Design a binder for this molecule. Sequence first.
Ligand SMILES: Nc1ncnc2c1ncn2[C@@H]1O[C@H](COP(=O)(O)OP(=O)(O)OP(=O)(O)O)[C@@H](O)[C@H]1O
Ligand SMILES: Nc1ncnc2c1ncn2[C@@H]1O[C@H](COP(=O)(O)OP(=O)(O)OP(=O)(O)O)[C@@H](O)[C@H]1O
Ligand SMILES: [Mg+2]
Ligand SMILES: [Mg+2]
Ligand SMILES: [Zn+2]
Ligand SMILES: [Zn+2]
Lengths: 296, 274
Amino acid sequence: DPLDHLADKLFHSMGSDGVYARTALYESIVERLAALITSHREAGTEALRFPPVMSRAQLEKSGYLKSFPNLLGCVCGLHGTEREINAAVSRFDAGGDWTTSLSPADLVLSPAACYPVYPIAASRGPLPKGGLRFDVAADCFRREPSKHLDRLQSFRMREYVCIGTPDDVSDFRERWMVRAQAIARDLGLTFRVDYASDPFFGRVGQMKAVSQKQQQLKFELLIPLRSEEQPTACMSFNYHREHFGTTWGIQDANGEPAHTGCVAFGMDRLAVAMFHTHGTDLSAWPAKVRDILGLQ
Amino acid sequence: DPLDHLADKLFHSMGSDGVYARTALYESIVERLAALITSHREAGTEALRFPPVMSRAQLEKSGYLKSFPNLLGCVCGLHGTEREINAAVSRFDAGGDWTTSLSPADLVLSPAACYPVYPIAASRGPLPKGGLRFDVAADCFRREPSKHLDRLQSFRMREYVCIGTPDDVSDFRERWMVRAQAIARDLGLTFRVDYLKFELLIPLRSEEQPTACMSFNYHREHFGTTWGIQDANGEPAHTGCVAFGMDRLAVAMFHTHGTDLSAWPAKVRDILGL
Ligand SMILES: Nc1ncnc2c1ncn2[C@@H]1O[C@H](COP(=O)(O)OP(=O)(O)OP(=O)(O)O)[C@@H](O)[C@H]1O
Ligand SMILES: Nc1ncnc2c1ncn2[C@@H]1O[C@H](COP(=O)(O)OP(=O)(O)OP(=O)(O)O)[C@@H](O)[C@H]1O
Ligand SMILES: [Mg+2]
Ligand SMILES: [Mg+2]
Ligand SMILES: [Zn+2]
Ligand SMILES: [Zn+2]
């Protein structure tokens, strides 16, 4: 794989594919990419930082189980009696299996950074005219083990979220599709923006992907990482229509179910794209690129 | 509780006790506290940043299941066939329970930041004279639901780790017991060092029951034996770590100095940038 050779200076193995320790070099680039995205934050955008976990009921309510049940990471623990727990530990001491005593928690590992904002916005009452803007970030989890550096199980997602009228969301999504391209250009990255679909699970998933594809609810900024034939989605421009507005009872300035959209930045994918494109020696990175990332 | 009102300017509810969204105000303070801890990093310290998850087998081998089996957050998923997964979702649609189809993954949510460092160090062969120093950080998880702001289920842990002879670890722990106190003093915090485990305790809820915001943990040759880490003399390596509770230190700052950064002491504002 063309990315493999980057692994030595960027990561350390943690005994699980797509779960790596980040080196000081890798992390300074993720941080500078994070700061760069912050510099493009529109005015009146509320910044929220989410933990790696969220409410299981909120995620169930958002329809994620119907879409990607195979990717979901659910939190599990020993919630039994002291007797039950001591027995589970004893089986583990005796070389047996303690995990049979596991039961689900009321938490899941967040599969996308924006899920938790909708309930938070719903709790504030009706939206003002112009809607609401959020800047969200989270360490996400998707059960997709791979040896490829651009397909992780644990990865950082930064997003700008629009909640409002279909016009508010549409304007936002157009403004962002322009800005996201200017950012990837400034970073010296080769890309193309194309219509796309979410990887919906199963037979129904195929129909759902095809419908989303033609409705143009999803665009992606694709960067060639392993091949020019199969580029990697490093940014997403998603229009949810009134899905979250209806689910959470978010109301427009005009009392209608609110429309939502989000621009997602794959922090780990963008950092890998930078190192693949420009190499592991920062002193050799183009001056324009080094300048925008605050180096020099 | 004396911390409760802090929540308005600090957090947003996420529908689970001890799991909150951080505001821009709270987050800038966590970041500045993180940068401050970095400025005290001794020469030759390797910086590693860990994700919220780690190997389940590595944690099982650490001895954590023996100690706090009730706190451990394991990762579970639907690893069945497409037929089984579609049926699980269908049971949920029909008012049943989809979770019966869950099975454990090979991952856990990390309960302490240092755990993954030991197999990484072990893979490098014998330790040089003087041992190895690491600077690690992770978003940790402990299944301890609470309404108190100083006791979270998802929280940030920053740590400096020493791997070497009992002398290397002892020197390191003496150096950090001093440095940790200088940091808390510089930050204008009221503390007492107590509790082999040191804790730097700060009153947040009460002066009677202060909160452990920093700690030194000595692990003996536990990880050295478990992972086959050999010092320069070929003996099982000893390990120690100084832990900083990022969320607890952020809450301690706001409790001590208030939510208005412009009113924070000039020395405190200076050391944190600002
Ligand atoms: N498994 C992953 N590893 C690393 N980064 C990822 C992964 N999945 C998504 N991302 C990043 O987070 C962004 C937002 O997530 P999104 O739901 O739009 O992804 P996706 O449609 O599943 O992408 P892909 O087709 O590659 O699986 C992506 O554009 C990408 O930049
Ligand atoms: N549940 C928690 N919520 C927030 N921060 C925590 C929590 N547990 C531990 N910490 C922080 O992580 C640091 C190192 O963790 P450690 O295992 O040493 O603490 P602990 O003895 O379990 O603390 P406590 O007695 O309060 O439970 C602590 O010193 C504290 O700063
Ligand atoms: Mg996906
Ligand atoms: Mg504890
Ligand atoms: Zn989103
Ligand atoms: Zn530790």
